[PDB]
């Protein structure tokens, strides 16, 4: 796809299950495997118990190779650091 | 470089591998193949229920990988 322009920018990479990987986009391929530097994963969880509120989890990862098979969406989160 | 080249540069280093079903394999990447199948050694694994255990060697197929955490 047209992705070489997005190199070095901060991207929001969303998996099929809704996990959000936010990192600096450094590499990609035809399968959509991505290299995300200074990457964190965010999840938004809705508890089974209806009296409990949606909650969030953040994991600081680092240099991440994200597999393209699960990647469903990609949006610009911010300019390059 | 291209993602696969980045993975090859981690050969000899400790990597973290998270599978599509939530298992976490952490250890020395001995060899990554073109399809991202990874041979790892002296690993620490965290299973889905949080059980932590160790294994001398594992072979994690790239099609089972959610993400890999590489050095640097």
Curated annotation (Swiss-Prot), chain A:
Domain Sm stretches: 1-80
Cellular localization per UniProt: Cytoplasm, Cytosol; Nucleus
Function text: Plays a role in pre-mRNA splicing as a core component of the spliceosomal U1, U2, U4 and U5 small nuclear ribonucleoproteins (snRNPs), the building blocks of the spliceosome. Component of both the pre-catalytic spliceosome B complex and activated spliceosome C complexes. As a component of the minor spliceosome, involved in the splicing of U12-type introns in pre-mRNAs. As part of the U7 snRNP it is involved in histone pre-mRNA 3'-end processing.
Lineage of the organism: Eukaryota, Metazoa, Chordata, Craniata, Vertebrata
Similarity comment: Belongs to the snRNP SmB/SmN family.
Gene (UniProt): SNRPB
UniProt protein name: Small nuclear ribonucleoprotein-associated proteins B and B'
Shown part of the complete sequence: 7 to 87 of 240
Effect of residue 49 to S: In CCMS; expression of the protein is reduced
Organism per entry: Homo sapiens (Human)
Miscellaneous comment: Patients with the autoimmune disease systemic lupus erythematosus (SLE) have autoantibodies directed against some of the individual snRNP polypeptides. The most common autoantigen is called Sm. B/b' bear Sm epitopes.
Source superkingdom: Eukaryota
Transmembrane segments: none
Assembly with partners or alone: Core component of the spliceosomal U1, U2, U4 and U5 small nuclear ribonucleoproteins (snRNPs), the building blocks of the spliceosome. Most spliceosomal snRNPs contain a common set of Sm proteins, SNRPB, SNRPD1, SNRPD2, SNRPD3, SNRPE, SNRPF and SNRPG that assemble in a heptameric protein ring on the Sm site of the small nuclear RNA to form the core snRNP. Component of the U1 snRNP. The U1 snRNP is composed of the U1 snRNA and the 7 core Sm proteins SNRPB, SNRPD1, SNRPD2, SNRPD3, SNRPE, SNRPF and SNRPG, and at least three U1 snRNP-specific proteins SNRNP70/U1-70K, SNRPA/U1-A and SNRPC/U1-C.
Disease connection: Cerebrocostomandibular syndrome: A syndrome characterized by severe micrognathia, rib defects ranging from a few dorsal rib segments to complete absence of ossification, and intellectual disability.
PTM annotation: Methylated by PRMT5.
UniProtKB/Swiss-Prot annotation, chain B:
Keyword Acetylation: yes
The record's account of how the chain is modified after translation: Methylated on arginine residues by PRMT5 and PRMT7; probable asymmetric dimethylation which is required for assembly and biogenesis of snRNPs.
Gene Ontology CC annotations of this record: catalytic step 2 spliceosome; commitment complex; cytosol; methylosome; nuclear body; nucleoplasm; nucleus; pICln-Sm protein complex
Domain of life: Eukaryota
Parts forming coiled coils: none
GO BP terms: 7-methylguanosine cap hypermethylation; mRNA splicing, via spliceosome; protein methylation; RNA splicing; spliceosomal snRNP assembly; U2-type prespliceosome assembly
Leftover remarks: In the autoimmune disease systemic lupus erythematosus, antinuclear antibodies are developed with Sm specificity.
Protein name, per record: Small nuclear ribonucleoprotein Sm D3
Organism from which the protein derives: Homo sapiens
UniProt lineage: Eukaryota, Metazoa, Chordata, Craniata, Vertebrata
Gene name of the record: SNRPD3
Residues of the full protein shown: 4 to 75 of 126
């Amino acid at each position: 796809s047209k992705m070489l322009q997005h190199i070095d920018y901060r991207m929001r990479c969303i998996l099929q299950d809704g996990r959000i990987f936010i990192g600096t986009f450094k590499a990609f391929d035809k399968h959509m495997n991505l290299i995300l530097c200074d990457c964190d994963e965010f999840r938004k969880i809705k508890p089974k118990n209806s009296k409990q509120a949606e909650r969030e989890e953040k994991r600081v990862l680092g240099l991440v190779l994200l597999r393209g098979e699960n990647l469903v969406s990609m949006t610009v989160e911010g300019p390059p650091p | 470089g291209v993602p696969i080249k980045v993975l090859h540069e981690a050969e000899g280093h400790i990597v973290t591998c998270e599978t599509n079903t939530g298992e976490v394999y952490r250890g020395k990447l001995i060899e990554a193949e073109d399809n991202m199948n990874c041979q790892m050694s002296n690993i620490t694994v965290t299973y889905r229920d949080g059980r932590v255990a160790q294994l001398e060697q594992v072979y994690i197929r790239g099609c089972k990988i959610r993400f890999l955490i590489l050095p640097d």
